[PDB]
Amino acid sequence: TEAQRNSWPSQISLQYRSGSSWAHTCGGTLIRQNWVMTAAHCVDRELTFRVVVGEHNLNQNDGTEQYVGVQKIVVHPYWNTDDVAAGYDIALLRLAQSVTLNSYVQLGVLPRAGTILANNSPCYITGWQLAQTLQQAYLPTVDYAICSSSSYWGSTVKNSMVCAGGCQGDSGGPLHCLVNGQYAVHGVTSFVSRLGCNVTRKPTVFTRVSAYISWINNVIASN
C-alpha cells in the first residue's frame, strides 16, 4: 500500500540525471544533516546524483520537499559489485548543502553495534490503477540460521546481512523495524533472488547496517 504523506521524515530518494530531469534509483535513510545512507551498488555507475528529503511522489512537487546534490560519495572500501554476496553493500553520500530538519524531515536512527535481530520480528519495507509514489509493505525478518540453511540462500547469506519476507522499484529501499519500542533502520536492500520476489524459501536480503555502524562513525567523523 501507500505510506502516509510524511510517514518517514528520514526517507531519501537518490536520483540520477537523465536529459533534463532526475530519475529515481535507490531509497536510503538520512543519518545527519549532511549524510544519507544507501546501498553501495546504487552509487555504482559514474552518474551525477542528488538527493531529495521529505518526498512522497517523485513526479510532483507538494512544496513540502527539499532537494540537494551530493558533494562526494564514499562506498565501503571492501565493496565490490562482482561479489555482492560478500556484503559491503553500503555507501555514505555527503550532501553538498546541509538541511533544515522540518516537521517533515527529521534524521534517521540506526541500531546498536553488534545488535542482532530476532526472527518473526516485524519490519516494513518502504520505497517507491497506479503509477509512482512512496509505498510501503510488511516484510518480517528471517532468523539468520534459516536464511543460511541450504534450504534458503545458503552460504551467500552472511551474518552481516538481514533476510525479510521469504524488492524491485525503490532499489536500496530502507528496512525499518520495531525492536520493542525503538524503530530505527536495521537494513538497506542488498540483493534479491534471481526470479524477483515470488520465489519462496528465498527471501530478499538486506545489509545488516548495524554490522557497519562503528564504520559509519569513523567515516562521518573523518571530515
Binding site: S18, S21, A23, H24, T25, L130, Q168, N198
Partner: protein
C-alpha cells in the same frame, strides 16, 4: 545495395558456435533474425556502454558500420522479408508492451515503429495473469498456432517487455515422394538408434563435398526464392563443421548452382527449441544490459528499468512436402 546480412550470419555462428561447446548430444535450433532484431530494436533505446555491448556483441562492430545502416539496413531487411510471394510464406512481426501513457522517450517511440514497424501495446503489468497471456496471444496469431504460449511466468514489477514473431512455410520445388519415404533407422549415436520416416529421392542435386568444411553440402530449394542448406560431417569429423562454419564459405555455396545426379535420404523432422539468453548472450558479450549499468535512456526517462531475461523459441518441420518452421523472442525489463 543494402546488406548487413554477413554480420548477422557470423552472429548466427558465434551464437550457435556456443551451444555447440556446452552440449554435444542435444538438438540445437534457434533463429538469428528473430533474436538479432530484438536487441537491435532495443538498441534504439540502449545507450553508452550498454548500447555498445549489446551491439558489437553480435558481430555488428561499430568502428566499421554506422548505426544508421545497422538500423536502416534492417527496416529494409524485414520490410523486404515480410513482403514475400505466393508459393512461399515468410512473415515476421515486432511489438513491445509497456504501461499506458508510459515515460516513453518521444524520439524512441518513432524509431522502432519506423525502422522496424513494431507495434506498441500498453500492457497492465499489475495482474500478470493478463499480461503473460495477452502477449502469447500475439505470436500465435502470427505463428499460425506454432506458439500459443511463449511465456509462462514474468515478474510483477516487470517494467517493460519486448517481443517479435516469425512464421515460415516453404515448399521444395522438387518434393520427395510420400511413398518412396521408407521407415529407416536413424544412426543416432555409437549405440542408440531410433526409427524415423526417412524420405528418399534420386536424381540431380546441388549436393557437394569440400575439404575445409569437410561434409556433404546439400542446398535444396523452395518456391519463393529460399534455400535450406544441410551439412553432413565426416565419419567423426563433426566437431570440424561446427567450428568451420563461416559466412565467407557459405556465400560461395549459395552461388554454386552446378548439380550432379545422386541419391538422398532425408528423415521427417519436428523438433523444438527453447532457452534463456540470460547466460549465453552474456557469455557472448551481453551481460552489460543484464547488469548494474542498464543504460536504457532511449527506452524511458522515468526511472531505470533493466534487462531481466532473454526468452527465445523456434519450431522446425521437415517432410517430403517441404518445411514449415517458426519462432520468436521475448524480453523483460524491470527497475533498479
Amino acid at each position: 545495395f543494402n546488406k548487413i546480412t554477413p554480420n548477422l550470419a557470423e552472429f548466427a555462428f558465434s551464437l550457435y558456435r556456443q551451444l555447440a561447446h556446452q552440449s554435444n548430444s542435444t538438438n540445437i535450433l534457434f533463429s538469428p533474425v528473430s533474436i538479432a532484431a530484438a536487441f537491435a530494436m532495443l538498441s534504439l533505446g540502449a545507450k553508452g556502454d550498454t548500447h555498445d555491448e549489446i551491439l558489437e556483441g553480435l558481430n555488428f562492430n561499430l568502428t566499421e558500420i554506422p548505426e544508421a545502416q545497422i538500423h536502416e539496413g534492417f527496416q529494409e531487411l524485414l520490410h523486404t522479408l515480410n513482403q514475400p510471394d505466393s508459393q512461399l510464406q515468410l512473415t515476421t512481426g515486432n511489438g513491445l508492451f509497456l504501461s499506458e501513457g508510459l515515460k516513453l522517450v518521444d524520439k524512441f517511440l518513432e524509431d522502432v515503429k519506423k525502422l522496424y514497424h513494431s507495434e506498441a501495446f500498453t500492457v497492465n503489468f499489475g495482474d500478470t495473469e493478463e499480461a503473460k497471456k495477452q502477449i502469447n496471444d500475439y505470436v500465435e496469431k502470427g505463428t499460425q498456432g506454432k506458439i500459443v504460449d511463449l511465456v509462462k511466468e514474468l515478474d510483477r514489477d516487470t517494467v517493460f517487455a519486448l517481443v517479435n514473431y516469425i512464421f515460415f512455410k516453404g515448399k521444395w520445388e522438387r518434393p520427395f515422394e510420400v511413398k518412396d519415404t521408407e521407415e529407416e533407422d536413424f544412426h543416432v549415436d555409437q549405440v542408440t538408434t531410433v526409427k524415423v520416416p526417412m524420405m528418399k529421392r534420386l536424381g540431380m542435386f546441388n549436393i557437394q563435398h569440400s575439404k575445409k568444411l569437410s561434409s556433404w553440402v546439400l542446398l535444396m530449394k523452395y518456391l519463393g526464392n529460399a534455400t535450406a542448406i544441410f551439412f553432413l560431417p565426416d565419419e567423426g569429423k563433426l566437431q570440424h563443421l561446427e567450428n568451420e562454419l563461416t559466412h565467407d564459405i557459405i556465400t560461395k555455396f549459395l552461388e554454386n548452382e552446378d548439380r550432379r545426379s545422386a541419391s538422398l535420404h532425408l528423415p521427417k523432422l519436428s523438433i523444438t527449441g527453447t532457452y534463456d539468453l540470460k547466460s549465453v548472450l552474456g557469455q557472448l558479450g551481453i551481460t552489460k544490459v543484464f547488469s548494474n549499468g542498464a543504460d536504457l535512456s532511449g527506452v524511458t526517462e522515468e526511472a531505470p528499468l533493466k534487462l531481466s531475461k532473454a526468452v527465445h523459441k523456434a519450431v522446425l518441420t521437415i517432410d517430403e512436402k517441404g518445411t514449415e518452421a517458426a519462432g520468436a523472442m521475448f524480453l523483460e525489463a524491470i527497475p533498479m
